[PDB]
Nucleic acid binder design. Structure first.
Lengths: 93, 96, 106, 81, 88, 69, 79, 97, 96, 82, 102, 92, 109, 91
DNA sequence: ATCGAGAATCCCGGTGCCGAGGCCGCTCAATTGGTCGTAGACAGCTCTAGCACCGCTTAAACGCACGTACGCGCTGTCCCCCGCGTTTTAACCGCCAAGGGGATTACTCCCTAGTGGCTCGAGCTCAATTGGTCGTAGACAGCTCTAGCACCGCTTAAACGCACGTACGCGCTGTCCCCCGCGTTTTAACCGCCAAGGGGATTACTCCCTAGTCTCCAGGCACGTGTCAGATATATACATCCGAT
DNA sequence: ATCGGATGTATATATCTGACACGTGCCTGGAGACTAGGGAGTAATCCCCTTGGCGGTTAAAACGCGGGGGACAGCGCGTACGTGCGTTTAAGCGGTGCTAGAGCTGTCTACGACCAATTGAGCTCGAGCCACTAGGGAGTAATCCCCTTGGCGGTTAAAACGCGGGGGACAGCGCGTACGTGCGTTTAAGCGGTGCTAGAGCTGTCTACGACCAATTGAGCGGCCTCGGCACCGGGATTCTCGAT
């Protein structure tokens, strides 16, 4: 009976950035479609970019060069920053 | 007290650009989708969410086409949008 | 000891564990490294936060406390980078930016 | 059991669509022209959808078939499924 | 000389001089990476791409011009073509 | 070096593209267009080299950079 | 280059007519070209390698017939 | 305004071309194909004409045999128009794919 | 409850494609081979390795032919294999 | 009990072989048809095989005669005497 | 010449040389090349008869490739022997699928 | 610069079977490629089955079992007859 | 003038496969009058290579099936799932090997 | 009564030391090496004969490997072969 | 660019409702820890090939001037779209229930965990290695004349694009064959042990056959030649196909 | 089936040209002849693996049967493909360079065959060590209930529509500007190379790091209830157009 989404996490981020505002159901579906879409773009480019280089593993390097490919300009910088900072905040277990 | 030609028009442009609702009536579009769908398979049902996806797509596509067509019309030093413009727009868009 | 979620070690709201599962199941690779899902989750959270701030300020600017589709559309279509990223997408129930060609004014 | 419904896309509706698109004056032979364009667009999105639905071996096309059909046609749609 | 359309439309050979284009691609590349080398196959691939893109844009541009009841291409037309093709 | 792409060449292209007459302001304009196209494709190409631990841009990198368009 | 499309549609139609087919769908004309290309790509690839082992620079008819024979398609009339 | 029933000059052509015994592709476009295709595998090859004609005889024979097999697949599905489904089934059964 | 037609069939497909053993009963096939061989030469012995080589060959050949036949059947928009399919398949194969 | 052994190839056996080939529904006139094709396939290989053992002036068909016959007729077989 | 002792037109001496020089064996028996010559002459003669009558029935006097193609492809055994072979300039047997006739 | 072929012999047999008819050059090339091919078949198989029985000599027995392997049916029978006839006349 | 210790050419080449046997087979196989001295080390080297390729693929294929031996089925799974190797061995049948699991999609529920 | 069994076992224990091989799989393996041997030697002999040379050297063997083997196999094999020959010539 | 009129929107305060949002109970997807086998990072080497730079013709870029096409703005006629009031239509709401059909559940089958053949050493033997002789393939360089590219002018077959209409592809519908699932009944496959011999395999023994070498010559290859078989050009004769009776 | 009435192919009739058949001249190879010696033939014998032989159990084949799902035929439509015509295009025939290189040559070194003897690797032979009864997953048939389809009943928003008159489409016109062209000048691309070395692409080695496993649990999800944020309304306040001048 259960079907998954990203709704609780975009609510978490939403209350992180705008504690006062909320969100309607449709806007929630837009956000979830956005997260799924950008996920499939990044993972797609990462898989193809692993294949071109004949390497059988998707690493954080593939994700970051894919992120440099899909995102335009300054976004790709912040994305590359957050993504790497988080990974180090994870490496020190 | 008539309104000069061309002022109620852009009044409507402001109104409908500020609005967000679907602009073609629901049941006619629904029956259109059903009649079109009968060609590829006859016994087809549609989840209401599905026809609503198809209408959001349709109206979005048509407003984008209409703005591009408006650009062509203005490019021919005109204010009246006419099939010349739409056919040029879908020609360059590659929509054939 | 008592288990923590990878998303918390990463400092993220988005689910690193889910992202990993989706990466593996979708057969994008034979094998997925351990930093991939935490990175990808981090970027999804970043973009999510970007659109959610801009939309937040859209709704706030419009005397409302709730983000509605139109607020997300105003958010993206007025931001060059997002509008490029989301150039060939259509925000359902979002409408279009108010714009009248100057030649059509009186 | 329906036919001739392309005329059901009323002229005021098309007029509104043009108004949202920023059009001020609209020629009269467009209203039919637009209908033509609309039909073929829809004819494709639906046809694509059905193959997705037929692939899932169902008898109702779900909104995901619409969204997949559009995504293949380079017009991704947010808010459904 | 409408023959120029005849001749060059029938042709299948590069229309921009190779090595000037080579320095163009090299200068453009200096922004993204320092001391890039290019195998010739690559520069010829992107030059062929360039030529294809430019001829397609030029056909669309001529369609805009003809639509405006002119015969000479003007920046109006190229910008109109790129603003409906989905370009910047 | 953007002005290396010469007027007879832009001409040869517009004629290849079936153009009768050409306003003189086109050239710089089309030059600009060319730049951005190159500026984009080239960029993607080199990020396919940077990811491949390479310093030369191979032709595969430009065909992958091209299909990204 | 880009020579494949140079094998005209009427030609393909003729080959088909010799093969005894009456009515032919249009998407064959592209399909067949593909089918031809890879086929040719194989035999020619063999032939040139036969040339390269022989330290020559002209592909002879014997390289073609050897290529065809080693691909299970023996050809009579050239040596 | 004499018109032949659709289908008449078609098999008229198949009768003609089956009794014929000549190459069916223009030899110079075919030669340009052979030259460009070979150009990838080695640079500036020369070709004795007998060789290029060997390759055309082989090519045309292969294509007419494939066409009879595909035609057989087409009629087996109870139509008369050959379409790429037929070609792909035929090559998959002969072991080419 | 009872199984719909065509379910135990797919169970057998999964089972035998995952399986790797000979599917023809050993001794009937053995005397088949011996009877066939008596036509070409009389008073023959067979080392067991030989008849088992012939059975591995026979069964492999038959499963490959059956896949091709299934492809012909599916190509005619059917699910049932019929001699039309076998004859078409080993005609494209060139098996006279 | 040596004559008519082509009938000894039961309908279930053929059915299994077909299932391994991935077929779901099987018409009945195949059970005879397949028998026929098998009879001829086998008829060829043994013939080749027998001539090989007839050339070596022996009286037992060896496994090498079968594997050589199978290669000779374009169906190489791995696992029996190399 | 040995070919005359054997009673054949084909060259026993040439075929013998080919067997020895040809990477088939080390020692070549004495009866092998005359047997092989005999068989090559036999098959040659058969297809040359069928081709002969094909050309003659075409009212042309000289055997052309097409005549060899009709000769081979219309004879069951010969068609099998030369199955994966391609007779250059030979064309195909006239054959129209019956379902396609008018 | 001297390149041998089988042309003279296929012409001799051709006049044996049809003295009035002749042969084109192209058909001659098909004939010579054909005899070369069948030679390669018979000699190849003869060498292989000589190698299978440890024997090191290709004799008429290897040629005839090879011709039984390669030639189909009545062709094979008639061929084996011709070969034995030629060998027997040669021996005397 | 005593000899040197006999060392095998197969070891000089750095191979497990027998250069000496391969050489003997080349000469005795009536392939040529003369076999070059570097030919058998080349041929042995390639035979060992392909052996290694299919033998690894089969080995870890069997290890996925949680078994300590390689059985025919494991090497056929190795061969038929590798595009190049399957292409090379498209005309052979691994006795006791079975077939790759695959059900035509139209036949699934 | 020889075969290639010991060498394929040596290669096996070189690449996967824990796993072993059944007799049947062993016959599949050496039957495979025998077949591929006859392929390479066959093409080498044919193209040595075509270019009217009486010696099958490492040059013919490599063109045979290029004709028979597909793609990267033919590349990787060629590396082994040439490297082996060099390791043999210097030793 | 005024002023009154006044029409349309804009705005604000009230009504009330439906979904946003949070507690909750809970289930199932994420976490946890240790092996271990291998993907990939990294380093170094081989030699490709990328790069910067040489001059030299000549193709082409370039700089004017000239005169002409074109486009751009102005004007007159006029077609047809806009705005609006009045009638006409069918959309919308909500609600309703029946039920299709997709979701969810309860079995059931598969697929594992658990309680004889293939590796290892002792004793030969047949083949691989050694190293020195000897005879020849073939490595190598070059001279020649074949023959493969390259271009070109004319003709004219053939590609090509397209207009038109029917014939075929494709789906949809109904019916009835006939295949599958499944339980019962009926064979005959498989298996169990065992020995007698056929026939394959070894061995040993002499001996017929073939390779190999040389000299002789005639049979077969390379050109040259002359011509008639077939090629090409045109006309007629005849076999068709189309439609209508 | 059966006339006319076109259409297109086959055949015929004329002419001619070049591919084929035969001589001419040469030269490489096949034919005798001869001995050695090595593989082949033959005998006896050794020994293994093929063949039988018979019942007993029971795993599987055969059989029967109910239904259900799929083959298959008939029909209806729409549109893809085949025919046909006129225009365009480049192919192909013919005949010309020119020069890359296929093809033949001689020569002298390498290198690979050949042998004897020598040893060890690989073979063989024997010995001995590594089915049931649960519980998750995967399909799958039954069953649950959610969500699609269709009806009520209107009223009422929204489509239709009809009409005049305002304005924008558009066609022409005139004129001035700013492309196009042509020809004299130049310049730098292109091209055959050399000189150098960064790096690419490949191999080898070693480690770090992800697959992989059930067992546990707490994060997230379906359900459920509450309440305020937000849509909607009415009527006034603002602003924004319109006309006349």
């Amino acid at each position: 009976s259960r079907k998954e989404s990203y709704s609780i996490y975009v609510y978490k981020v939403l209350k992180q950035v705008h504690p006062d505002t909320g969100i309607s159901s449709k806007a929630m579906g837009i956000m979830n479609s956005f997260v799924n879409d950008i996920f499939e773009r990044i993972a797609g480019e990462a898989s193809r970019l692993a294949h071109y280089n004949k390497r059988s593993t998707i690493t954080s390097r593939e994700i970051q060069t894919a992120v440099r490919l899909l995102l335009p300009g300054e976004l790709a910088k912040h994305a590359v920053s957050e993504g790497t900072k988080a990974v180090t905040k994870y490496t020190s277990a | 007290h008539r309104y000069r030609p061309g002022t109620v028009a852009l009044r409507e442009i402001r109104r409908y650009q500020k609005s967000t609702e679907l602009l073609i009536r629901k049941l006619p579009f629904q029956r259109l989708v059903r009649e079109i769908a009968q060609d590829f398979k006859t016994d087809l049902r549609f989840q209401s969410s599905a026809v609503m996806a198809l209408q959001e797509a349709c109206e979005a596509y048509l407003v984008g086409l209409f703005e591009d067509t408006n650009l062509c019309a203005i490019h021919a030093k005109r204010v009246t949008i006419m099939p010349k413009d739409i056919q040029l727009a879908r020609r360059i868009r590659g929509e054939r | 000891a008592k288990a923590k979620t990878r998303s918390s070690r990463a400092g993220l709201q988005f689910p690193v564990g889910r992202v990993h599962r989706l990466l593996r199941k979708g057969n994008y690779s034979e094998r997925v490294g351990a930093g991939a899902p935490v990175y990808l989750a981090a970027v999804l959270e970043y973009l999510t936060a970007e659109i959610l701030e801009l939309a937040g300020n859209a709704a706030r600017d419009n005397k409302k406390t709730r983000i509605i589709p139109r607020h997300l559309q105003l958010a993206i279509r007025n931001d060059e980078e997002l509008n490029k990223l989301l150039g060939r997408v259509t925000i359902a129930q979002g409408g279009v930016l108010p714009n009248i060609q100057a030649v059509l004014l009186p | 059991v329906l036919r001739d419904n392309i005329q059901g896309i009323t002229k005021p509706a098309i007029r509104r669509l043009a108004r949202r698109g920023g059009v001020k004056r609209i020629s009269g032979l467009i209203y039919e022209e637009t209908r033509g364009v609309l039909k073929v667009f829809l004819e494709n999105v639906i046809r694509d959808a059905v193959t997705y639905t037929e692939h899932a071996k169902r008898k109702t096309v779900t909104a995901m078939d619409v969204v997949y059909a559009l995504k293949r046609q380079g017009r991704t749609l947010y808010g459904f499924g």
